[PDB]
Amino acid sequence: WDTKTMSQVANNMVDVIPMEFTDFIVPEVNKELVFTEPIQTIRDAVVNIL
Amino acid sequence: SQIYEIYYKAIFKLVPEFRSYTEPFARASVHLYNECKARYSTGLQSHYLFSPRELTRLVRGVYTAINTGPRQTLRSLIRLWAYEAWRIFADRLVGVKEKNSFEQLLYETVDKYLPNQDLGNISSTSLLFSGLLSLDFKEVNKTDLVNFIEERFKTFCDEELEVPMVIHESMVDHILRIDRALKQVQGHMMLIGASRTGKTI
Amino acid sequence: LLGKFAVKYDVNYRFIDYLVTLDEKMKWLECGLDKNDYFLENMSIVMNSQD
Amino acid sequence: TDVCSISSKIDHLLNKSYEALDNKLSMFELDKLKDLISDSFDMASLTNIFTCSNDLVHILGVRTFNKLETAVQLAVHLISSYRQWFQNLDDKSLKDVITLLIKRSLLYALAGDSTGESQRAFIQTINTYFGHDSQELSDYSTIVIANDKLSFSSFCSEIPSVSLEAHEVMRPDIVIPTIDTIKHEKIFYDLLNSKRGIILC
Numbered sequence: 001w002d003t004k005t006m007s008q009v010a011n012n013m014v015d016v017i018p019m020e021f022t023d024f025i026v027p028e029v030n031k032e033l034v035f036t037e038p039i040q041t042i043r044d045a046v047v048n049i050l
Numbered sequence: 051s052q053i054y055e056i057y058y059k060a061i062f063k064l065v066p067e068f069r070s071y072t073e074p075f076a077r078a079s080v081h082l083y084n085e086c087k088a089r090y091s092t093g094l095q096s097h098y099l100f101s102p103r104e105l106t107r108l109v110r111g112v113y114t115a116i117n118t119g120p121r122q123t124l125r126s127l128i129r130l131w132a133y134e135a136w137r138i139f140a141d142r143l144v145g146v147k148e149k150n151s152f153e154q155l156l157y158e159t160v161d162k163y164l165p166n167q168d169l170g171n172i173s174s175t176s177l178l179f180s181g182l183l184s185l186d187f188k189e190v191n192k193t194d195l196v197n198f199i200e201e202r203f204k205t206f207c208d209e210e211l212e213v214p215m216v217i218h219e220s221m222v223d224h225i226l227r228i229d230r231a232l233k234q235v236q237g238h239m240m241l242i243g244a245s246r247t248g249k250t251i
Numbered sequence: 252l253l254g255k256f257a258v259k260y261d262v263n264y265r266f267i268d269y270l271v272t273l274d275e276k277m278k279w280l281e282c283g284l285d286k287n288d289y290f291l292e293n294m295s296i297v298m299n300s301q302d
Numbered sequence: 303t304d305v306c307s308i309s310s311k312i313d314h315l316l317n318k319s320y321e322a323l324d325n326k327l328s329m330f331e332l333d334k335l336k337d338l339i340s341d342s343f344d345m346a347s348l349t350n351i352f353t354c355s356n357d358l359v360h361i362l363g364v365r366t367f368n369k370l371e372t373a374v375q376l377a378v379h380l381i382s383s384y385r386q387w388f389q390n391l392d393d394k395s396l397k398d399v400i401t402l403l404i405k406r407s408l409l410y411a412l413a414g415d416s417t418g419e420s421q422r423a424f425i426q427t428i429n430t431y432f433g434h435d436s437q438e439l440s441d442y443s444t445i446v447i448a449n450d451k452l453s454f455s456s457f458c459s460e461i462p463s464v465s466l467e468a469h470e471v472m473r474p475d476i477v478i479p480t481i482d483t484i485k486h487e488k489i490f491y492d493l494l495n496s497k498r499g500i501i502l503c
């Protein structure tokens with residue numbers, strides 16, 4: 001499995017679960033730019049970490 | 051080139067207006083083969099063997115594609131031919147660099163021999179010729195395949211057992227390859243790869 | 252990697268203390284598990300897996 | 303060491319095949335044929351040729367001593383196949399045909415395991431160590447019984463043109479009539495008809 005396939009599968013599994021709003025998740029985006037998935041929300045942050 | 055010029059003329063009796071192009075197709079076919087045989091040698095992987103039988107599977111596949119297809123245009127003929135070339139030559143390749151170089155080789159070959167105006171991306175995932183949704187074998191749209199496989203696979207899991215699997219674009223590609231295998235008269239398939247990656251299901 | 256992203260955490264997290272209540276924690280030792288933390292984590296993993 | 307000479311083994315093989323063929327053939331034809339082969343076949347130039355075999359790149363590497371069977375059996379079978387025609391000929395034309403057959407049999411006995419170019423290069427040697435009056439051997443040359451009995455034609459490329467229907471692309475028994483294939487099928491069936499075993503490597 002490639003990175004894109006893993007990302008798609010992970011996003012699909014993650015999407016169903018509820019996600020409480022967390023104020024700090026936005027200013028981090030600006031910084032790193034590793035370019036490992038389109039910048040978004042917690043859902044992508046979690047996917048990249050995994 | 052002579053043998054296959056005869057084969058192309060025979061099969062283009064079904065599409066007689068395009069008979070003139072039988073020469074460049076045959077020449078393209080052997081040229082691709084030679085460079086394939088040259089650049090992907092057995093020194094990379096021991097299963098990289100290429101006989102002239104690769105071209106004979108090719109023409110029979112192209113035949114079948116034409117026989118069970120709709121009205122073609124030259125753009126369609128080239129797309130179809132690209133699909134066949136993909137499923138013959140490149141499925142055995144490992145390494146994304148090898149598939150990318152195969153794309154480059156394909157573009158060069160067609161540019162050399164069939165210089166037409168409306169070819170688009172020739173990526174393996176951009177030319178989903180299907181025979182499932184439609185009665186006749188033709189290049190169908192990715193969205194509709196997705197929705198069809200989702201609903202049918204849901205139905206399959208409801209009717210059979212409880213396995214949770216999420217559809218993804220590689221899965222639908224491999225589905226189409228297996229369909230292509232199983233619909234041949236004597237198609238035997240071999241699925242190399244890792245564990246936990248859906249083969250047996 | 253968490254601090255590389257926006258995922259903050261308990262800086263003082265401990266897996267055993269996070270996952271295992273004291274009753275189960277004792278219950279295992281009454282059943283005779285060795286009092287070595289590596290074993291405690293292993294026992295947590297094996298009893299907590301479902302399916 | 304080997305127990306016998308190459309020459310004596312040739313003589314033995316000749317007599318051995320004569321044991322089979324002589325009873326069927328009538329004596330008047332028989333004697334003229336059998337000395338007509340023995341004397342011509344026993345010349346020194348053929349030995350010269352054997353010494354010129356050992357540097358050629360044979361596949362599988364069977365030593366020249368163990369190749370005489372193929373030469374003798376194929377020669378004697380071939381010559382004996384034309385007996386019904388030979389009876390009317392003048393000596394000159396008969397000698398010519400006999401020479402040409404022996405040269406062709408020597409060629410394939412000694413160089414059929416060689417990769418093509420070696421064979422065409424070896425043809426020059428065969429045409430050189432036999433006498434120039436004797437019929438020249440060419441790779442394309444084939445003998446066809448033209449019009450009445452005894453007007454043999456040494457021609458090449460008599461290729462029939464195949465009118466394939468489209469669906470016959472997937473007849474697995476099909477093949478395209480090509481000069482290479484024509485001569486291989488020819489020599490194959492001749493070797494078969496001599497009742498010798500074959501290995502197609």
Ligand SMILES: N#Cc1c(C2(c3ccc(Cl)cc3)CC2)nn2c(O)c(Oc3cccc(Br)c3)cnc12
Pocket residue numbers: 213214215216217243244245246247248249250251
């Ligand atoms: N559930 C499931 C299942 C999975 C996982 C899965 C993968 C994709 C998706 Cl979308 C959902 C789940 C759970 C990780 N992989 N997986 C297979 O690889 C199967 O075929 C085999 C079996 C044994 C050896 C080999 Br080699 C192939 C059969 N089932 C599965």
